[PDB]
Amino acid sequence: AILGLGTDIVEIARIEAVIARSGDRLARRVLSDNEWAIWKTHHQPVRFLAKRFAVKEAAAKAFGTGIRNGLAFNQFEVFNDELGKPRLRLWGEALKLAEKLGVANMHVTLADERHYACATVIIES
Amino acid sequence: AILGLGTDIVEIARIEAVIARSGDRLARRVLSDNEWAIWKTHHQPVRFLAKRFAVKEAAAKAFGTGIRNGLAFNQFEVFNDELGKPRLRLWGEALKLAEKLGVANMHVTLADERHYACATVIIES
Amino acid sequence: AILGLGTDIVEIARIEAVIARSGDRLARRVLSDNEWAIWKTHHQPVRFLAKRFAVKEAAAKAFGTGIRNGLAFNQFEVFNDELGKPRLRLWGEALKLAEKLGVANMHVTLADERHYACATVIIES
Ligand code: NA
Ligand code: NA
Ligand code: NA
Ligand code: NA
Ligand code: NA
Ligand code: NA
Ligand code: NA
Ligand code: NA
Ligand code: NA
């Protein structure tokens, strides 16, 4: 029943340094068009981006494919449900891959301390 | 089937600072009566509290309840079995919630370094 | 169904300090023959060893640390498949224990930042 498992850890100060070197580049690689617009106006953009990077990198690793099946970051996004829990929403080729794998349930968890954000994703049939 | 997933990370030095500001308040909030009695005489109270917080916060996220404070920290506790695996024991509304969700198994794992403790919890039917 | 869950976090500088004190001792203890051969010529050997330690401690916790004696980190070999995905290959008593437990699938995920490596392992029937 478990189709894949993924984890990530992000050092928030490293993302801050990346933004200072190359501006919006990291945000546009990692965020969807929708999420990019929220980062542009967020009050804690570095922490927002660090936590999203953690979730989306964990989700990409959970899907677990090489370049042949690229779950590009620009075809899925994270949102919070009514309880504040992170949830994944997929479209385009990202959603097509989930259908091909027979993904029936996705589990997402995220935590952050001052200096690090960590996330785990499990996809299941 | 996986019913929920939760993870947490705790910066031990942040817990140390919390204790310096407000004494036993954090311990009284996170620990059950039984766990409080061990903390009172523990040789590493800060680390004991940091690791229990990580496990119990991970566990609350795995239950992922919309019941306002449905998995209250004062209604469950952690112990180790003969294999060294951390285990959850629930009473009151916490146990009622577990029964309503149909929880048949609870998997808990915990790790700590000098500066951080982390934990992941999966509940399953 | 899930047979076990384990997580670990490794402070890389702690591994680096161990190596400065006792050289190859740690690597020779925890790594399998295959992993030892990579450690000897790796361009980032300390980071290699720290990440392997994270997987081996996570996998040990998943199987159950106090189960038996004669289990050892060098029997939890990690390798990369043709996609670069980390995978477990078991030898000796670890392989026997897996067969006794009815392990049908093993899921491994690993992530590293500059100061920490973390891993989670799930074994399943
Ligand atoms: Na921190
Ligand atoms: Na306190
Ligand atoms: Na204890
Ligand atoms: Na115990
Ligand atoms: Na348990
Ligand atoms: Na700390
Ligand atoms: Na540490
Ligand atoms: Na050594
Ligand atoms: Na780091």
From Swiss-Prot, chains A, B, C:
Keywords: Cytoplasm, Fatty acid biosynthesis, Fatty acid metabolism, Lipid biosynthesis, Lipid metabolism, Magnesium, Metal-binding, Transferase. Its main location: cytoplasm. Its EC number is 2.7.8.7. GO terms for molecular function: holo-[acyl-carrier-protein] synthase activity; magnesium ion binding; transferase activity. Changing residue 4 to D: 5-fold reduction in catalytic activity. One of its GO terms (cellular component) is cytoplasm. SUPFAM superfamilies: 4'-phosphopantetheinyl transferase. Pfam families: ACPS. It is found in: Cytoplasm. InterPro entries: 4-PPantetheinyl_Trfase_dom (IPR008278), 4-PPantetheinyl_Trfase_dom_sf (IPR037143), ACPS (IPR002582), Ppantetheine-prot_Trfase_dom (IPR004568). Mg(2+) binds at residues 8, 57. Its cofactor is Mg(2+). The keyword Metal-binding applies. It comes from the Bacteria. It catalyses: apo-[ACP] + CoA = holo-[ACP] + adenosine 3',5'-bisphosphate + H(+). One of its GO terms (biological process) is fatty acid biosynthetic process. Belongs to the P-Pant transferase superfamily. AcpS family. Transfers the 4'-phosphopantetheine moiety from coenzyme A to the 'Ser-36' of acyl-carrier-protein. Homodimer. This is Holo-[acyl-carrier-protein] synthase. It comes from Escherichia coli (strain K12).
